Design a protein around this motif. Structure first.
Motif, PDB file in Angstrom:
ATOM      1  N   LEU B  92       0.823  -1.176   0.000  1.00 60.68           N
ATOM      2  CA  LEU B  92       0.000   0.000   0.000  1.00 60.68           C
ATOM      3  C   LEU B  92       0.863   1.233   0.000  1.00 60.68           C
ATOM      4  O   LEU B  92       1.797   1.265   0.745  1.00 60.68           O
ATOM      5  CB  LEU B  92      -0.845   0.002   1.253  1.00 60.68           C
ATOM      6  N   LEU B  93       0.516   2.249  -0.788  1.00 61.59           N
ATOM      7  CA  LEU B  93       1.238   3.535  -0.780  1.00 61.59           C
ATOM      8  C   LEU B  93       0.180   4.651  -0.802  1.00 61.59           C
ATOM      9  O   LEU B  93      -0.708   4.670  -1.701  1.00 61.59           O
ATOM     10  CB  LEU B  93       2.153   3.631  -1.968  1.00 61.59           C
ATOM     11  N   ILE B  94       0.180   5.450   0.248  1.00 62.17           N
ATOM     12  CA  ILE B  94      -0.749   6.534   0.388  1.00 62.17           C
ATOM     13  C   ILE B  94      -0.001   7.827   0.345  1.00 62.17           C
ATOM     14  O   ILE B  94       1.005   8.008   1.063  1.00 62.17           O
ATOM     15  CB  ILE B  94      -1.561   6.458   1.697  1.00 62.17           C
ATOM     16  N   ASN B  95      -0.536   8.748  -0.450  1.00 60.29           N
ATOM     17  CA  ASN B  95       0.048  10.085  -0.576  1.00 60.29           C
ATOM     18  C   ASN B  95      -0.917  11.006   0.203  1.00 60.29           C
ATOM     19  O   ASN B  95      -2.076  10.895   0.082  1.00 60.29           O
ATOM     20  CB  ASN B  95       0.145  10.571  -1.989  1.00 60.29           C
ATOM     21  N   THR B  96      -0.384  11.844   1.059  1.00 59.24           N
ATOM     22  CA  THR B  96      -1.203  12.675   1.967  1.00 59.24           C
ATOM     23  C   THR B  96      -0.982  14.151   1.748  1.00 59.24           C
ATOM     24  O   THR B  96      -1.413  14.985   2.572  1.00 59.24           O
ATOM     25  CB  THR B  96      -0.902  12.359   3.446  1.00 59.24           C
ATOM     26  N   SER B  97      -0.275  14.537   0.683  1.00 63.04           N
ATOM     27  CA  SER B  97       0.210  15.953   0.650  1.00 63.04           C
ATOM     28  C   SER B  97      -0.933  16.911   0.250  1.00 63.04           C
ATOM     29  O   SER B  97      -1.924  16.497  -0.398  1.00 63.04           O
ATOM     30  CB  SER B  97       1.358  16.091  -0.320  1.00 63.04           C
ATOM     31  N   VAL B  98      -0.796  18.154   0.671  1.00 62.28           N
ATOM     32  CA  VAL B  98      -1.619  19.225   0.132  1.00 62.28           C
ATOM     33  C   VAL B  98      -1.161  19.527  -1.318  1.00 62.28           C
ATOM     34  O   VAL B  98      -1.995  19.650  -2.202  1.00 62.28           O
ATOM     35  CB  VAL B  98      -1.652  20.503   1.039  1.00 62.28           C
ATOM     36  N   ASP B 150       1.573  -6.421   4.548  1.00 60.54           N
ATOM     37  CA  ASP B 150       2.650  -6.503   5.508  1.00 60.54           C
ATOM     38  C   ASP B 150       3.414  -5.205   5.697  1.00 60.54           C
ATOM     39  O   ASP B 150       3.928  -4.944   6.769  1.00 60.54           O
ATOM     40  CB  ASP B 150       3.583  -7.639   5.064  1.00 60.54           C
ATOM     41  N   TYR B 151       3.522  -4.427   4.625  1.00 54.45           N
ATOM     42  CA  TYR B 151       4.251  -3.190   4.646  1.00 54.45           C
ATOM     43  C   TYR B 151       3.468  -2.140   3.873  1.00 54.45           C
ATOM     44  O   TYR B 151       2.858  -2.459   2.870  1.00 54.45           O
ATOM     45  CB  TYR B 151       5.645  -3.381   3.989  1.00 54.45           C
ATOM     46  N   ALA B 152       3.502  -0.897   4.335  1.00 51.06           N
ATOM     47  CA  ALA B 152       2.832   0.229   3.685  1.00 51.06           C
ATOM     48  C   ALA B 152       3.762   1.416   3.656  1.00 51.06           C
ATOM     49  O   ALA B 152       4.534   1.581   4.580  1.00 51.06           O
ATOM     50  CB  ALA B 152       1.658   0.635   4.532  1.00 51.06           C
TER      51      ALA B 152
END
Ligand code: CER
Ligand code: CER
Ligand code: MN
Ligand code: MN
Lengths: 331, 331
Positions: B92-98, B150-152
């Motif tokens: 999983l890869l989540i981008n949180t930026s403004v 298992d990893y994000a």
């Protein structure tokens, strides 16, 4: 201890409520073409790309300057009615739309504010092109399955009016250009919302099992060859769905598919052997409503009485990334 | 069967890896003021709002046209090193930026693409003003706790260069205006990434317990009275944290707080009786890096050897919405 596909599926997540909003104003592809005609003549391009290549006869637009948040609010009030519950019950509200009011705050907080959520309600936007509403259902589902909340709203309002204005503007004064830009004229306006709940709280409600995602982010660059990559991605995603959900195409009762164009859809359905009668389509009259497309089509199926208890319903799409997600609802 | 606060906490979620990127170019508030001076004279405003009201001596900027995705990629390569794992492990890869590259695809897919994630890796952006990185940690945590992954990676790159260019431009030719606009000059550039993992896979790694959110979306409209509402929201959120995490201010070892300005920070810390020595601050030299602020400050604490096994670390902020979140890491 030994893993099985069915282990990752949600057991206690249901759909309590579902509603959509059709945008009111019809713009037919013919009226658009009459404005584009001098420009088709200009470039010496004889083809009706919209009507003939894309298969779009019309789309819906808003009548006034409707913001994404307004459209999501309206759909959300309807979905609460459909669920027979007050806003006070909502512990999570996720906004999934491509259209967005501001840099900040989230569109979700603006919708929450309009609805009057309680101070306990967690809110945020998820962005993932045309698949985000499935992402938001999955996110809500995990919180529900754990007991962190009892009810969640997933919402999505889309507006394309400024897009069409800007785009028609540029399509009157070069062919690489004129072509790149026609694709904005397949978009439409509209909105959807869904209320999800812990199953014990809504006995007999439709059940959300979850689903699978695969990606081909090597292709984040990106139509000829994009359809091909899309299909190959979906093939893999179907293999994942078989491994987790136990899917076979012939055991599904409806396919609620994100739609890009009549040929992309035609190619998808042929490629996987799907019965076209099991694929409701609104694109020719509503255009592509982005991530709201899936739940709108699901809400339309419901309202037409086209669903029966026990029906296995497949939610899917292919989105920019590239990504593909496939999830199951058992009505 | 009988609910308790500690029931909703994550049991098997850890931080495997953490890294930040400082943007390289320092712009001091004095150089900015010299460009603004004719305009301070113009409006007859004698106050050094930046230096004196906000407490910002400098901020960092990029040296070149760095996109959010590029900055998040760089931080993400560093955090994989810190975790000693290959990208193939990331589910999983989540981008949180403004800051955001495009309408679509997600910033997350572009970062994933740069890193070379596998086809199994799920990606999407979360948007929630300055609290999104805590939202993204929580989202990843639920998937980890369930065994779906298992990893994000949670990532966040911020860029403010175009903002400063546009803003200085407008601050040279009205006071309601000139005032509204000074607040963009408290922002800074930078990036953070974190690798989260199932605890059995990373024995002894720092533990992410989760946290609480409260909201006051009645105030989504929105500084005098905004500080007050912020504090009242945080008060309530602290009550929630006490009910779930068992927090008392004096039993926490560090507070990693989102920072808006030296006075907003001063007011917060006074209001809650916090020991200022337990609040690392980078705002005066780096400005406000939006949602990346929290993990940057956490990564800086770590690199300075300022954390010890067993340390209870409080992650918090107040974001536009209004929202407030508070989560705990046990080092
Ligand atoms: C059948 C293959 C389809 C692949 C098409 C991908 C492009 C999709 C779009 O650009 C929008 O409709 C949806 C989206 N951005 O997610
Ligand atoms: C102490 C009270 C603080 C409330 C301030 C709220 C405004 C915050 C901002 O505008 C940005 O720094 C962060 C954000 N948008 O989330
Ligand atoms: Mn009309
Ligand atoms: Mn420099």
């Amino acid at each position: 201890l030994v893993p099985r596909g069915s282990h990752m599926l949600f057991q206690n997540v249901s759909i309590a409520g579902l509603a959509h909003i059709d945008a009111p104003h019809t713009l037919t592809s013919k009226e658009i073409n009459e404005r584009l005609q001098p420009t088709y003549d200009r470039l010496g391009i004889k083809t009706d790309v919209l009507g003939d290549v894309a298969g779009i006869h019309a789309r819906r637009l808003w009548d006034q300057d409707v913001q994404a948040s307004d459209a999501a609010t309206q759909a959300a009030r309807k979905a609460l009615i459909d669920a027979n519950i007050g806003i006070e019950k909502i512990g999570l509200l996720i906004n999934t739309s491509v259209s967005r009011d501001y840099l900040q705050p989230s569109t979700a907080s603006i919708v929450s504010g309009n609805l009057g959520v309680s101070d306990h309600c967690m809110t945020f936007d998820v962005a993932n092109a045309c698949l985000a509403f499935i992402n938001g259902m999955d996110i809500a589902a995990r919180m529900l399955e754990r007991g962190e909340i009892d009810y969640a709203l997933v919402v999505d309002g889309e507006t394309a009016n400024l897009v069409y204005e800007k785009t028609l503007e540029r399509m009157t004064s070069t062919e690489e250009e004129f072509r790149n830009e026609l694709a904005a004229l397949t978009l439409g306006c509209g909105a959807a919302a869904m209320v999800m709940a812990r199953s014990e709280l809504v006995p007999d409600a439709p059940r959300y099992k979850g689903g699978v995602t695969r990606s081909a982010t090597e292709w984040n660059k990106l139509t000829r060859l994009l359809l091909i990559e899309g299909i190959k991605l979906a093939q893999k995603t179907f293999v994942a769905a078989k491994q987790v959900l136990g899917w076979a195409v012939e055991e599904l009762d409806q396919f609620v598919i994100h739609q890009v164009s009549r040929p992309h859809t035609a190619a998808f359905v042929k490629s996987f052997g799907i019965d076209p009668a099991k694929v409701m389509t609104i694109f020719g009259e509503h255009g592509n409503i982005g991530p709201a497309s899936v739940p709108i089509v699901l809400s339309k199926l419901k309202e037409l009485g086209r669903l029966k208890k026990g029906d296995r319903i497949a939610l899917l799409g292919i989105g920019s990334g590239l990504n593909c997600s496939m999830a199951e609802v058992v009505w």
